[PDB]
Amino acid sequence: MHVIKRDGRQERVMFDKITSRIQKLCYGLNMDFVDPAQITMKVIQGLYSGVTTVELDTLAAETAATLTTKHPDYAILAARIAVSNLHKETKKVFSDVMEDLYNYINPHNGKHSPMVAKSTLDIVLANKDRLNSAIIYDRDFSYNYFGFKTLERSYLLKINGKVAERPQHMLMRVSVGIHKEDIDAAIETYNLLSERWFTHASPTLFNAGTNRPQLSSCFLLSMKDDSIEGIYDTLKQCALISKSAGGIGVAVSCIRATGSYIAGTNGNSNGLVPMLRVYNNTARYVDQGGNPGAFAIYLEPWHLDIFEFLDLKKNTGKEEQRARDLFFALWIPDLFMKRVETNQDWSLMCPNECPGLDEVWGEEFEKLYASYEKQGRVRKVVKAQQLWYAIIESQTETGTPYMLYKDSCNRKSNQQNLGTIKCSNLCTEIVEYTSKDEVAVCNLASLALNMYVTSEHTYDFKKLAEVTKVVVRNLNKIIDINYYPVPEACLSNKRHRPIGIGVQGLADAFILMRYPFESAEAQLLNKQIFETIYYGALEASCDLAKEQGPYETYEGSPVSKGILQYDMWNVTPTDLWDWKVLKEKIAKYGIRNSLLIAPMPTASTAQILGNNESIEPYTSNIYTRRVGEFQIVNPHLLKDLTERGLWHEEMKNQIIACNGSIQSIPEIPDDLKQLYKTVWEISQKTVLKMAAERGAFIDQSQSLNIHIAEPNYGKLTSMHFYGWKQGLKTGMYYLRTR
């Protein structure tokens, strides 16, 4: 049997040498239980000659990690093997790789197909020395296995199926991609990224410093008008956006209900369902080729086609009445929620008979809607609770529709001055204005909240503010570098310049501080963290306004009137920051950006940094990551248990037997039990309340998943109405059950 070495040379597979390599990575490990030869034994078993050393290493790392259930130091050793491989794979000089990427010629086409932009290469080559030596390759070793594998599959640019970029190369590419000739700023961003203080969103990581760069890849659209021309103009837009791998939120309420008269053709409308089938199949077709585009459809509950809308995602159905590749969201007026709880009637309307209901919010809506009712301009009236039951039935079956409160969204938007906001995005965190001329764009990044806790269990608020300021500046440069799939998107971003800074590792930051998720300490830290993020962001935005002038539509906005987000929630901030001093700077110069903060799902990027997603509690203390499948214990809990000498094979078994819960294990002290409660054991009302409290400092919204183990109508009702009454903009993203 032979391995193929990196140099392409053939080497005899030898027990002693494989064992030997594993041995050298065992410094500080418990050798009474960790046995290098144990790994070598299982590796050599299923091993065929023609295997490469990179494959061998991968196998050995994956094997070491199944032996975690023999001793936890095996999991460390597995990472040590993976990182050892990562170091060997990380050409050594940055500018060299950039040339290789640019000079790439497709083999079966013969065509010069640069993988980086010429103008990026040019900047890199002009600044070779400074750029190449700024890179710290030891930072490649800071990841865990599962983060590395995510990077390796999608994020490191490959030459002919072989990875050419080290993680550090990718990061410097992004940095130069954002800052171009400002090498000072590029190096500051590279340092911040490589030391893991924050991350740019996947779109930016993918395409920064490439040709026609798609740096923002979430969008929002309103249906143009209620016509075949309008419907198909918007469809083209969505197709074009989806080709650029853009996710989309689409508002659809202006479209005539089923049975509505068409004066042109003397016929009757088919309503939303058949139209949404065209959008569904457009999502399946324009999926970048070979693999489906993702569109979230927004509907207001006064619309007559609401009940059929609520069914489009049901897996049991009728095919022609289904659109299971779309995602569904409600854009809900307060009036609906008030009629539900008072048990009144709800009127279903056709927007053609009752125009402008989507162009109007709050008291103006309730007034317009009430006069349509009084004029008898109503197609069908149901008890409001009947529609409510359909909503909760849909969520029990599918986890959707998402719940957005239209009046909350509009009453507390700094984009208020533009007109009524008709919808949110794919992920329900963005609240940005759309119109015929304007498709809104989400320009996104996240702060790694675990990084700001010190060795002394204190939170570094100053550092967080300072990193946030860089993030604002970076995202603001992205607005101008971005290649837009449609011109309405470009118009929108250049006019109002919104951005969306979010977070990851909230749960990790609580645990590192030793706070239970539900404790007074965590609830106060939660406010403080988000005050800080809002404060630094406004401050950076104000600085850019001093240097470049405010955004076009600044005059008339709430902030131009001295109104900040927490003013809109009637909240008084803590004493941590001087907001009076910030307001006085904003009164002087204005701000560069209409919106700033929007906690998104961090599915892919949180995995890379090794943080829990977003603002979310750990959903379990033991979970699996697919790469084969790998078993993972909550890394904070496992350390605690091993430090105390409590961890063993059956102890892992009993936690799996408890659905990832540790509450009923009698050997665990109660302070650990409260630290490591799962999301299924944490009060969802408390989650909702904590989101509302941080919400006062988020000028957009937040993708809030809700976890109810065994739902019924009473559970879902009381949580939705609680979220609504807290003032939440997004009451629920997904509903998770078990």
DSSP secondary structure letters along 34-56: --HHHHHHHHHHS--TT-BHHHH
Three-state DSSP class for residue 248: strand
On whether 6 is known to bind a ligand per the annotation, the reply is: yes
Identify how many contiguous H helices and E strands the chain contains and give both numbers.
Answer: 30, 22
Say if CB 438 and CB 486 are below 8 A apart. Answer: no
Structure tokens at 61: 């790392």
459/498 same-domain check: yes
CA–centroid distance for 36 within its chain: 39
Say if CB 388 and CB 314 are below 8 A apart. Answer: no
On whether 57 is known to bind a ligand per the annotation, the reply is: yes
- The single-letter code of the amino acid at 550 is P
Burial class from Cβ neighbours inside 10 Å (0-12, 13-18, 19+) for residue 710 reads exposed
On whether 264 is known to bind a ligand per the annotation, the reply is: yes
Helices (H), 103-163: 118-126, 128-134, 145-154
509, 510, 511, 513 alpha-carbon torsion, rounded to 10°: 80
Say if CB 440 and CB 219 are below 8 A apart. Answer: yes
On whether 14 is known to bind a ligand per the annotation, the reply is: yes
On whether 11 is known to bind a ligand per the annotation, the reply is: yes
560/644 same-domain check: no
Neighbouring residues of 32: CB distance < 8 A, sequence distance ≥ 6: none
Q: What whole-number distance in Å separates Cα of residue 179 and Cα of residue 188?
A: 10
Which run of H or E residues covers position 203? helix 202-207
**Cβ neighbour number for residue 376 with a 10 Å cutoff:** 7
Say if CB 594 and CB 497 are below 8 A apart. Answer: yes
Structure tokens at 461: 């608020």
Strands 198-200 and 444-448: antiparallel
On whether 162 is known to bind a ligand per the annotation, the reply is: no
On whether 639 is known to bind a ligand per the annotation, the reply is: no
Flag whether 708 is in a domain: no
580/624 same-domain check: no
On whether 429 is known to bind a ligand per the annotation, the reply is: yes
- The single-letter code of the amino acid at 164 is A
Output DSSP code: residue 483: P
On whether 150 is known to bind a ligand per the annotation, the reply is: no
Q: What whole-number distance in Å separates Cα of residue 634 and Cα of residue 622?
A: 6
Flag whether 643 is in a domain: yes
Burial class from Cβ neighbours inside 10 Å (0-12, 13-18, 19+) for residue 243 reads middle
- Say which residue the tokens 């700024």 belong to: 134
Say if CB 681 and CB 522 are below 8 A apart. Answer: no
Q: What whole-number distance in Å separates Cα of residue 343 and Cα of residue 347?
A: 13
Complete DSSP assignment for 339-405: HHHHT-EEEEB-TTTSTTGGG--HHHHHHHHHHHHHTT--SEEEEHHHHHHHHHHHHHHHS--EEEE
Torsions phi, psi of 593, nearest 5? -135, 130
Flag whether 95 is in a domain: no
61, 63, 65, 71 alpha-carbon torsion, rounded to 10°: -120
Output DSSP code: residue 479: H
Question: What is the domain count for the chain?
Answer: 4
| 429 catalytic per annotation | yes
270/395 same-domain check: yes
| 26 catalytic per annotation | no
**Cβ neighbour number for residue 726 with a 10 Å cutoff:** 19
563/656 same-domain check: no
Query: Around 59, how many Cα atoms within 13 Å sit in the side-chain half-sphere?
Result: 18
Check the CA dihedral 525-527-531-534 and report its sign: positive
Say if CB 286 and CB 336 are below 8 A apart. Answer: no
Complete DSSP assignment for 624-677: EEE--EEEEE-HHHHHHHHHTT---HHHHHHHHTTTT--TT-TTS-HHHHHHT-
- Residue after which a domain boundary falls, among 348, 370, 400: 400
Q: What resolution in angstrom units was achieved for this structure? A: 9.0
Three-state DSSP class for residue 219: strand
Experimental method: X-ray
Structure tokens at 348: 């279903």
Helix 183-194 and helix 167-179: axis angle, to 10°? 140
On whether 510 is known to bind a ligand per the annotation, the reply is: no
Q: What whole-number distance in Å separates Cα of residue 599 and Cα of residue 724?
A: 18
Catalytic residue, from 354, 423, 427, 542: name it.
427
Q: What whole-number distance in Å separates Cα of residue 682 and Cα of residue 675?
A: 11
Residue 522, CA distances (Å) to 330, 506, 561, 675, 738 in order = 31, 10, 33, 11, 27
Flag whether 389 is in a domain: yes
- Say which residue the tokens 């963005």 belong to: 430
Say if CB 542 and CB 472 are below 8 A apart. Answer: no
Domain that holds residue 12: 2-88
Closest C-alpha to 378, from 351, 344, 348 = 348
Structure tokens at 510: 């609580």
SS3 content of the chain, % helix, strand, coil (to 5): 50, 10, 40
Structure tokens at 653: 């078994």
Neighbouring residues of 318: CB distance < 8 A, sequence distance ≥ 6: none
- The single-letter code of the amino acid at 429 is E
Closest C-alpha to 510, from 612, 371, 648 = 612
On whether 43 is known to bind a ligand per the annotation, the reply is: no
CATH of the domain at 447: 3.20.70.20
382/332 same-domain check: yes
On whether 17 is known to bind a ligand per the annotation, the reply is: yes
Burial class from Cβ neighbours inside 10 Å (0-12, 13-18, 19+) for residue 310 reads buried
- Say which residue the tokens 């989650």 belong to: 687
Neighbouring residues of 93: CB distance < 8 A, sequence distance ≥ 6: 132
Three-state DSSP class for residue 475: helix
Which run of H or E residues covers position 222? strand 218-222
Complete DSSP assignment for 427-455: TS------BTTB-EEE-EEEEEGGGGB-T
Flag whether 520 is in a domain: yes
**Cβ neighbour number for residue 691 with a 10 Å cutoff:** 23
Say if CB 470 and CB 484 are below 8 A apart. Answer: no
Residue 526, CA distances (Å) to 123, 456, 615, 679, 697 in order = 41, 18, 10, 17, 11
Burial class from Cβ neighbours inside 10 Å (0-12, 13-18, 19+) for residue 406 reads buried
β-bridge mates for residue 447, sequence order = 198, 503
242/344 same-domain check: yes
Structure tokens at 570: 């009637």
Q: What whole-number distance in Å separates Cα of residue 484 and Cα of residue 237?
A: 11
84/117 same-domain check: no
CA–centroid distance for 375 within its chain: 45
Structure tokens at 405: 């409160």
Strands 295-299 and 327-332: parallel
Length of the chain: 738
Catalytic residue, from 429, 432, 438, 488: name it.
429
Q: What whole-number distance in Å separates Cα of residue 342 and Cα of residue 323?
A: 33
Say if CB 467 and CB 198 are below 8 A apart. Answer: yes
Say if CB 565 and CB 535 are below 8 A apart. Answer: no
Over the Cα atoms of the chain, what is R_g? 27
On whether 725 is known to bind a ligand per the annotation, the reply is: no
Flag whether 266 is in a domain: yes
On whether 53 is known to bind a ligand per the annotation, the reply is: yes
- Say which residue the tokens 């965590």 belong to: 522
**Cβ neighbour number for residue 6 with a 10 Å cutoff:** 11
Question: For the chain, how far is it from start to end, CA to CA, in angstroms?
Answer: 47
Query: Around 711, how many Cα atoms within 13 Å sit in the side-chain half-sphere?
Result: 22
Q: What whole-number distance in Å separates Cα of residue 428 and Cα of residue 75?
A: 37
Q: What whole-number distance in Å separates Cα of residue 687 and Cα of residue 526?
A: 11
In three-state form (DSSP H/G/I as H, E/B as E, the rest C), the secondary structure along 501-529 is EEEECHHHHHHHCCCCCCCHHHHHHHHHH
Neighbouring residues of 433: CB distance < 8 A, sequence distance ≥ 6: 413, 415, 418, 419, 421, 440, 492, 496
Burial class from Cβ neighbours inside 10 Å (0-12, 13-18, 19+) for residue 442 reads buried
- Say which residue the tokens 């021309």 belong to: 229
Query: Around 691, how many Cα atoms within 13 Å sit in the side-chain half-sphere?
Result: 32
Q: What whole-number distance in Å separates Cα of residue 496 and Cα of residue 508?
A: 34
On whether 12 is known to bind a ligand per the annotation, the reply is: yes
Q: What whole-number distance in Å separates Cα of residue 591 and Cα of residue 608?
A: 32
Three-state DSSP class for residue 539: helix
Say if CB 296 and CB 249 are below 8 A apart. Answer: yes
On whether 174 is known to bind a ligand per the annotation, the reply is: no
Structure tokens at 377: 């301009």
456/542 same-domain check: yes
Strands 380-383 and 444-448: unpaired
Closest C-alpha to 326, from 289, 288, 272 = 272
Neighbouring residues of 386: CB distance < 8 A, sequence distance ≥ 6: none
**Cβ neighbour number for residue 480 with a 10 Å cutoff:** 9
Say if CB 423 and CB 383 are below 8 A apart. Answer: no
Residue 255, CA distances (Å) to 309, 328, 544, 550, 555 in order = 13, 16, 41, 36, 33
| 30 catalytic per annotation | no
On whether 244 is known to bind a ligand per the annotation, the reply is: no
Output DSSP code: residue 701: -
Flag whether 203 is in a domain: no
On whether 15 is known to bind a ligand per the annotation, the reply is: yes
On whether 605 is known to bind a ligand per the annotation, the reply is: yes
Burial class from Cβ neighbours inside 10 Å (0-12, 13-18, 19+) for residue 631 reads middle
Catalytic residue, from 414, 425, 493, 634: name it.
425
Torsions phi, psi of 631, nearest 5? -80, 130
77/155 same-domain check: no
Torsions phi, psi of 625, nearest 5? -120, 125
Residue 72, CA distances (Å) to 41, 413, 599 in order = 19, 49, 34
268/353 same-domain check: yes
Structure tokens at 291: 């693999």
Complete DSSP assignment for 276-344: HHHHHHHHHH-SSS-----EEEEE-TTBTTHHHHTTTT-SSS-STT--TTSEEEEEE-HHHHHHHHHT-
Which run of H or E residues covers position 580? helix 579-589
Strands 402-405 and 730-732: antiparallel
Starting at the edge strand that comes first in sequence, how are the strands of the sheet with 402-405 ordered?
Answer: 440-442, 218-222, 247-251, 295-299, 327-332, 402-405, 730-732
Say if CB 38 and CB 67 are below 8 A apart. Answer: yes
β-bridge mates for residue 623, sequence order = 632
Flag whether 411 is in a domain: no
Residue 336, CA distances (Å) to 210, 284, 346 in order = 47, 34, 7
β-bridge mates for residue 559, sequence order = none
In three-state form (DSSP H/G/I as H, E/B as E, the rest C), the secondary structure along 65-110 is HHHHHCCCHHHHHHHHHHHHHHHHCCCCCHHHHHHHHHCCECCCCC
288/237 same-domain check: yes
